[PDB]
């Protein structure tokens, strides 16, 4: 009974593009690039009340980050960047940008037919990772 319900559940990766290029934008380092780009990622998406649970596991690391929309909070990314993030609704998309050490990246989520969609962007480089249902 909102509409960030067709985000709630559990997702698994099926596909991704340029998402190396992506992470070297953004400063990670080659055995982690490496490591992280062989990761099949679930992603648990759920709510409850105003706060939203993104948890993403895999066999590289499992994160869980718990926002309320429009407000920042300090995130420690799978690379180990520590980031300002702040998570929004803009017209059905949720739109997450984190900001550390003067720069900046964009990560967008997006219900697609069946799937869901994540563009990263991290200067002119985007990468983009399909999710389907689980
Ligand atoms: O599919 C996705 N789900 C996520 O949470 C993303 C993963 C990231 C990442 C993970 C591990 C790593 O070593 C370096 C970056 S940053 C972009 C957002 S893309």
Redesign the pocket.
Same mark, same amino acid.
């Given at each position: 009974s909102h509409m960030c319900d067709a985000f709630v559940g559990t997702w698994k990766?099926v596909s991704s593009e340029n998402?190396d290029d992506?992470?070297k934008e953004?400063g990670?380092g080659f055995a +982690?690039?490496k490591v992280?780009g062989m990761?099949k990622?679930n992603?648990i998406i759920s709510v409850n009340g105003d706060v939203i649970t993104i948890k993403?596991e895999s066999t590289?690391?499992n994160?869980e980050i718990s926002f309320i929309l429009g407000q920042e909070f300090d995130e420690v +990314?799978?690379?180990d960047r520590k980031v300002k993030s702040t998570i929004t609704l803009d017209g059905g998309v949720l739109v997450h940008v984190q900001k550390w050490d003067g720069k900046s990246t964009t990560?967008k989520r997006k219900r697609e037919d069946d799937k869901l969609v994540?563009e990263?962007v991290m200067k002119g480089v985007t990468?983009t990772?399909v999710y389907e249902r689980a």
């Amino acid at each position: 009974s909102h509409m960030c319900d067709a985000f709630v559940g559990t997702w698994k990766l099926v596909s991704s593009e340029n998402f190396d290029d992506y992470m070297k934008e953004v400063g990670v380092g080659f055995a +982690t690039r490496k490591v992280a780009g062989m990761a099949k990622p679930n992603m648990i998406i759920s709510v409850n009340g105003d706060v939203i649970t993104i948890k993403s596991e895999s066999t590289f690391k499992n994160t869980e980050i718990s926002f309320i929309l429009g407000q920042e909070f300090d995130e420690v +990314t799978a690379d180990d960047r520590k980031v300002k993030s702040t998570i929004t609704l803009d017209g059905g998309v949720l739109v997450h940008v984190q900001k550390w050490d003067g720069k900046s990246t964009t990560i967008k989520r997006k219900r697609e037919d069946d799937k869901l969609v994540v563009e990263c962007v991290m200067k002119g480089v985007t990468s983009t990772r399909v999710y389907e249902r689980a």
